[PDB]
Amino acid sequence: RFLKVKNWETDVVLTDTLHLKSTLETGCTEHICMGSIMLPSVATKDQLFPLAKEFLDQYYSSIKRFGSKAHMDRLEEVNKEIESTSTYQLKDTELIYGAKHAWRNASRCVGRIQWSKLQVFDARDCTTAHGMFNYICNHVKYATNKGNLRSAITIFPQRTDGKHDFRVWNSQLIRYAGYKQPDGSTLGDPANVQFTEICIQQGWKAPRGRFDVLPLLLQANGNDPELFQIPPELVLEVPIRHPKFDWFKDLGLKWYGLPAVSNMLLEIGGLEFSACPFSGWYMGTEIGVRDYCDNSRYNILEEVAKKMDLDMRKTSSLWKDQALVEINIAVLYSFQSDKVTIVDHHSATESFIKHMENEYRCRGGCPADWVWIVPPMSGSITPVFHQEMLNYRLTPSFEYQPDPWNTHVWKL
Amino acid sequence: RFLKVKNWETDVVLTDTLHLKSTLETGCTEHICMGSIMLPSVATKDQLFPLAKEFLDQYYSSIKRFGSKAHMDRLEEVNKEIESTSTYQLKDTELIYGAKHAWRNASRCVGRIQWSKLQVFDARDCTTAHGMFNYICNHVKYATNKGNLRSAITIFPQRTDGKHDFRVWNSQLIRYAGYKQPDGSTLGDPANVQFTEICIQQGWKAPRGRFDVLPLLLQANGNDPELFQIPPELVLEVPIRHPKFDWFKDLGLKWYGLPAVSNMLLEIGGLEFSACPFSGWYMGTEIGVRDYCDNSRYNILEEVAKKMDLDMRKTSSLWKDQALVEINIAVLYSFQSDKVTIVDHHSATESFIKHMENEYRCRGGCPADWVWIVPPMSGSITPVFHQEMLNYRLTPSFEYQPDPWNTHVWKL
Ligand code: HEM
Ligand code: HEM
Ligand SMILES: C[C@H](O)[C@H](O)[C@H]1CNc2nc(N)[nH]c(=O)c2N1
Ligand SMILES: C[C@H](O)[C@H](O)[C@H]1CNc2nc(N)[nH]c(=O)c2N1
Ligand SMILES: Cc1cc(N)nc(CCCN(C)C)c1
Ligand SMILES: Cc1cc(N)nc(CCCN(C)C)c1
Ligand SMILES: [Zn+2]
User: What is the rounded (10 degree) CA torsion for A178, A180, A185, A186?
Assistant: -10
Residues A240, A251: contact at Cβ < 8 Å? yes
Nearest to B329 among A35, A38, A317 (CB): A317
Query: A37 contacts in B (CB within 8 Å)?
Result: 5-6, 388
Contact status of A149 with chain B (Cβ, < 8 Å): no
Which residue lies with its CA nearest to atom 12 of ligand 5?
A261
Amino acid residing at A180:
K
Q: Which residues of B291-311 are buried (b: 16+ CB within 10 A; e: fewer)?
A: bbbbeebbebbeebbeeeebe
CB spacing of B376 vs A385 below 8 angstroms? yes
DSSP state, residue A223 = P
φ/ψ (deg, to 5) at B249: -65, -40
CA of B372 vs chain A CAs: smallest distance (Å): 10
Q: Is B211 annotated as a binding residue?
A: no
Ligand 6 pocket test: pick from B120, B266, B286 the residue with the most ligand atoms within 8 Å of its Cβ.
B286
User: What is the rounded (10 degree) CA torsion for A197, A203, A209, A214?
Assistant: -70
- Distant-in-sequence, close-in-space partners of B238: CB < 8 Å, separation ≥ 6: B254, B255, B256, B257, B334, B335, B338, B340
Please state, in angstroms and rounded to a whole number, the distance separating the CA atoms of residues A261 and B281.
44
- Mapped to the 3 state alphabet, what secondary structure does A114-149 carry? HCCCCEEEECCCCCCHHHHHHHHHHHHHHHHHHHCC
Choose among B223, B267, B277, B199: nearest CA to B408: B223
- Clarify whether A109 is annotated catalytic: yes
Please state, in angstroms and rounded to a whole number, the distance separating the CA atoms of residues B200 and B188.
15
Q: Which residues of B are catalytic?
A: 109, 112, 281, 286
CA distances from A366 to A137, A352, A354, A363 (A): 33, 10, 11, 8
Distance from the first to the final alpha carbon of chain A: 55
Residues with CB under 6 A from ligand 4: A 36, 38, 371-372; B 8, 385-388
Instruction: Collapse the DSSP code of A261 into the 3-class scheme (helix H, G, I; strand E, B; otherwise coil) and give the result.
Output: strand
This entry's atomic model was obtained through X-ray
Choose among B382, B353, B158, B154: nearest CA to B258: B154
Determine the distance from the C-alpha atom of residue B98 to the mean position of all C-alpha atoms in its chain, rounded to a whole number: 16
Choose among B375, B30, B13, B398: nearest CA to A34: B30
Please state, in angstroms and rounded to a whole number, the distance separating the CA atoms of residues A275 and A155.
6
Amino acid residing at A30:
E
Residues A240, A331: contact at Cβ < 8 Å? yes
**Ligand 1 neighbourhood includes A398 CB (under 6 angstroms):** yes
Q: Is A60 annotated as a binding residue?
A: no
Please state, in angstroms and rounded to a whole number, the distance separating the CA atoms of residues A163 and A222.
5
**Ligand 5 neighbourhood includes A261 CB (under 6 angstroms):** yes
Residues B337, B374: contact at Cβ < 8 Å? no
Number of H helices, E strands in chain B: 12, 18
Distance from the first to the final alpha carbon of chain B: 55
Q: In 3-state terms, chain B is what percent helix, strand and coil (to 5)?
A: 40, 15, 45
Choose among B384, B402, B358, B392: nearest CA to B264: B402
Please state, in angstroms and rounded to a whole number, the distance separating the CA atoms of residues A330 and A245.
9
CA of A13 vs chain B CAs: smallest distance (Å): 12
Which phi-psi region, left, alpha or beta, contains residue B367 (left: φ > 0; alpha: ψ -120 to 50)? beta
Contact status of B21 with chain A (Cβ, < 8 Å): no
**Sheet of strand B397-399, all strands in order from the earlier edge strand to the far edge:** B271-273, B265-268, B397-399
For residue B185, the tally of other CB atoms under 10 A from its CB is 9
Query: B388 contacts in A (CB within 8 Å)?
Result: 36-38
* Domain spans of chain A, in order of start: 16-124+151-161+265-279+349-373, 125-150+165-236+400-404, 237-259+282-347
Choose among B51, B102, B22: nearest CA to B270: B51
Report chain breaks in chain B, C–N > 2.5 Å, as residues after which they occur: 41
Q: Is B109 annotated as a binding residue?
A: yes
Task: Give the DSSP letter string of A347-365.
Answer: HHHHHHHHHHHHHHHHTS-
Please state, in angstroms and rounded to a whole number, the distance separating the CA atoms of residues B118 and B174.
20
Please state, in angstroms and rounded to a whole number, the distance separating the CA atoms of residues A349 and A382.
6
Beta strands in A194-236 (DSSP E): 216-219, 226-228
Task: Give the DSSP letter string of B148-215.
Answer: S---EEEEPPPPSSSSS--EE-SSBSS-B-EEE-TTS-EEE-GGGHHHHHHHHHTT-----SSS-BPP
Choose among B186, B194, B192, B197: nearest CA to B173: B192
Q: Is B172 annotated as a binding residue?
A: yes
CA distances from A363 to A104, B365, B390 (A): 11, 40, 32
CB spacing of B9 vs A295 below 8 angstroms? yes
CB spacing of A37 vs B388 below 8 angstroms? yes
Instruction: Collapse the DSSP code of A83 into the 3-class scheme (helix H, G, I; strand E, B; otherwise coil) and give the result.
Output: helix
Sign of the Cα pseudo-torsion (B33, B35, B40, B46, in order): positive
**Ligand 5 neighbourhood includes A170 CB (under 6 angstroms):** no
- Clarify whether A281 is annotated catalytic: yes
Instruction: Collapse the DSSP code of B75 into the 3-class scheme (helix H, G, I; strand E, B; otherwise coil) and give the result.
Output: helix
Residues A243, A329: contact at Cβ < 8 Å? yes
CA distances from A233 to A140, A230, A254 (A): 11, 8, 16
**Ligand 5 neighbourhood includes A135 CB (under 6 angstroms):** no
Ligand 3 pocket test: pick from B38, B107, B287 the residue with the most ligand atoms within 8 Å of its Cβ.
B38
Task: Report the nearest atom of ligand 3 relative to the CA of B37.
Answer: 3
Instruction: Collapse the DSSP code of B104 into the 3-class scheme (helix H, G, I; strand E, B; otherwise coil) and give the result.
Output: helix
CB spacing of A32 vs B390 below 8 angstroms? yes
Please give the distance, rounded to the nearest whole angstrom, from the Cα atom of residue B289 to the centre of ligand 1: 27
Determine the distance from the C-alpha atom of residue A34 to the mean position of all C-alpha atoms in its chain, rounded to a whole number: 21
Query: B385 contacts in A (CB within 8 Å)?
Result: 376
* B residues 1..20 contacting A (CB < 8 A): 3, 5-6, 8-10, 19
Nearest to B388 among A38, A381, A385 (CB): A38
Task: Give the DSSP letter string of B323-338.
Answer: HHHHHHHHHHHHHHHT
Choose among A165, A70, A105: nearest CA to A407: A165
- Check A103, A104, A109, A159 and give the catalytic one: A109
DSSP state, residue B64 = T
